[PDB]
């Protein structure tokens, strides 16, 4: 069955990005998905995305620029201490000067550098680069 809607959303984005398509339909649009996209959008990896309000669960159409190389989900959402952020960024990000580990902390969904300056931590959601 459906286990992680973020995983299917990020898979749809990855498969759309790999085939050159500038847009992708996402079902069924959880709030975690939107927060993951806004972090993506804030750094410019996607562009504009529109939520579609079917009265059931929501649909997303994301406009895609060519910048995103890979977005992913880390399953399960591992617990990440402040000291464990370095291991996660060095394990999955392509370099040190770009790319973001996206984690959910009690201060909200954010990328790893924002959690470093806000000095927060939590569980890892995924990554974008």
């Amino acid at each position: 069955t459906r286990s992680s809607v973020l995983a299917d959303a990020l898979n749809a984005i990855n498969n759309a990005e790999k085939t050159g398509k500038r847009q992708v339909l996402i079902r069924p649009s959880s709030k975690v998905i939107i927060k993951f996209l806004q972090v993506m959008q804030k750094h410019g990896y996607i562009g504009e995305f529109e939520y579609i309000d079917d009265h059931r669960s929501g649909k997303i159409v994301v406009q895609l620029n060519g910048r995103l190389n890979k977005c992913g989900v880390i399953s399960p959402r591992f617990n990440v201490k402040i000291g464990d952020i370095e291991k996660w960024t060095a394990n999955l990000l392509p370099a040190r000067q770009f790319g973001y580990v996206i984690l959910t902390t009690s201060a909200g969904i954010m990328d790893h550098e924002e959690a470093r300056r806000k000095h927060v931590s939590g569980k890892i959601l995924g990554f974008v680069y």
Binding site: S75, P76, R77, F78
Partner: protein, 144 residues
């Protein structure tokens, strides 16, 4: 999902699965069964001393043709009868019979060193004197 469970609460399954599958490793199985302690003739030690019982003419395994010089040795601590190679040229005349020898493995961790069938050990000392010393004339075996 790659087979193995991934859930954050599946540590026990991953632990037990690893435990079961380490038994397919030869070294882990041999170590935790204690085969060297219970079956190997040195009892798990690097060296062993014994008494020469007979000179041997072990033929070479194919494709090489040679007579490897070996000695039947009954180990002192066990009484187990093993075959030890006398390595260098003419060193059989130093290890003739009934003497006390020091034995070591061949470096194969219990297999055959070369074309010598069934021989696991080699001679390193004769009557307290290193076989390399007798072969290089540096020392001589006690005549009386």
């Amino acid at each position: 999902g790659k087979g193995k469970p991934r859930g954050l609460n599946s540590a026990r399954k991953l632990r037990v699965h690893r435990r079961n599958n380490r038994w397919a490793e030869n070294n882990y199985k041999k170590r935790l069964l204690g085969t060297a302690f219970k079956s190997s003739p040195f009892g798990g030690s690097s060296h062993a001393k014994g008494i020469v019982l007979e000179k041997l003419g072990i033929e070479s395994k194919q494709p090489n043709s040679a007579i490897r010089k070996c000695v039947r040795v009954q180990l002192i601590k066990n009484g187990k009868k093993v075959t030890a190679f006398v390595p260098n040229d003419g060193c059989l005349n130093f290890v003739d019979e009934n003497d006390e020898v020091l034995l070591a493995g061949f470096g194969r961790k219990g297999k055959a060193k070369g074309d010598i069938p069934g021989v696991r050990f080699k001679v390193v000392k004769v009557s307290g004197v290193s076989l390399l010393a007798l072969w290089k004339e540096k020392k001589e075996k006690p005549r009386s």
